[PDB]
Design a protein around this ligand. Structure first.
Ligand SMILES: O=c1ccn([C@@H]2O[C@H](COP(=O)(O)OP(=O)(O)O)[C@@H](O)[C@H]2O)c(=O)[nH]1
Ligand SMILES: OC[C@H]1O[C@@H](O)[C@H](O)[C@@H](O)[C@H]1O
Ligand SMILES: [Mn+2]
Length: 291
């Protein structure tokens, strides 16, 4: 049951005046695409605080990637769901390497020890298995957000993202035609998507939803990866290829714009991005991914 909102004074939405004319703000299946200017965060914060929403955030920090936790967590404290209840779940092979980060009230951090796989592909792919923990999350949080660790928050990331199931536009592909997307193109893979299909190219580094929908998605991607492995095939972009196939066949109920996953070193600051909210931390793939 949802109680009434209180009285609020804010600018009237004007029907004959779009919030944004330069971008698509709704998908053809009627899911909002979340850009700055499309939401009044005061209304959304009221709606979500009246439900006492708890948001879980999963992040894997395996092997050398424990070096990224301190900045990840400290900037998450400044920008991620401030005001709301947050439960961080840090999955790591080195619990003693997790930094002691000071948290705001109503926020908590659990360390979950897991095994480390040797190949960075397997570390990244096996997040889906590891996330799909199911009983714990159902009891502790309302939504789950699943992100890469090699990142920092630079601006607000809040309840405007929450919905039963979301993906995020990949920042290198948001202006690309579908034939250029780097979907898995071999029909022998469970992740396969033909050249005339596909809505968007979603990035593996930021997806989420209600616990039930996120467990559905990670269970389906893990089972699809297992099928591929048994068939001796590994999709071209690993978990990201599987996430893409899942979100093609199960349309997300919101899509985040590239505000929410950006790489300023590689892509700069285009005018279409009014805010850069969650951004890549520069790293040397070869070095950090190997002993
Ligand atoms: O040795 C590794 C390799 C990957 N990851 C996790 O897998 C995610 C995806 O890998 P990565 O960020 O290397 O992919 P990229 O963004 O560079 O394509 C990382 O953010 C970490 O959460 C990890 O913890 N240790
Ligand atoms: O083409 C897909 C790839 O695009 C890259 O820019 C990104 O670093 C990879 O992780 C993968 O998403
Ligand atoms: Mn990453």
């Amino acid at each position: 049951f949802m109680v009434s909102l209180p009285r609020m004074v804010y600018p009237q939405p004007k029907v004959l005046t779009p919030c944004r004319k330069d971008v698509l703000v709704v998908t053809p299946w009627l899911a909002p695409i979340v850009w700055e200017g499309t939401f009044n965060i005061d209304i959304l914060n009221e709606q979500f605080r009246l439900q006492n929403t708890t948001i879980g955030l999963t992040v894997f920090a395996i092997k050398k990637y424990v070096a990224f936790l301190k900045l990840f967590l400290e900037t998450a404290e400044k920008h991620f769901m401030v005001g709301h209840r947050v439960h961080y779940y840090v999955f790591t092979d080195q619990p003693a390497a997790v930094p002691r980060v000071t948290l705001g009230t109503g926020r908590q951090l659990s360390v979950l020890e897991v095994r480390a796989y040797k190949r960075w592909q397997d570390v990244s792919m096996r997040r889906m298995e590891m996330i799909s923990c199911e009983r714990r999350f159902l009891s502790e949080v309302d939504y789950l957000v699943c992100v890469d660790v090699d990142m920092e928050f630079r601006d607000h990331v809040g309840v405007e993202i929450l919905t039963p199931l979301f993906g995020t536009l990949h920042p290198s592909f948001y202006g690309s035609s579908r034939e250029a997307f780097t979907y898995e193109r071999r029909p022998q893979s469970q992740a396969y998507i033909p050249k005339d299909e596909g809505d968007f190219y979603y990035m593996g580094a930021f997806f989420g939803g209600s616990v039930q929908e996120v467990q559905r998605l990670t269970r389906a991607c893990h089972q699809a990866m297992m099928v591929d492995q048994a068939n001796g095939i590994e999709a071209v972009w690993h978990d990201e290829s599987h996430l893409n196939k899942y979100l093609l066949r199960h349309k997300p109920t919101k899509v985040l714009s590239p505000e929410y996953l950006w790489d300023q070193q590689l892509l700069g600051w285009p005018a279409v991005l009014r805010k850069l909210r969650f951004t890549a931390v520069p790293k040397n793939h070869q070095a950090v991914r190997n002993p």
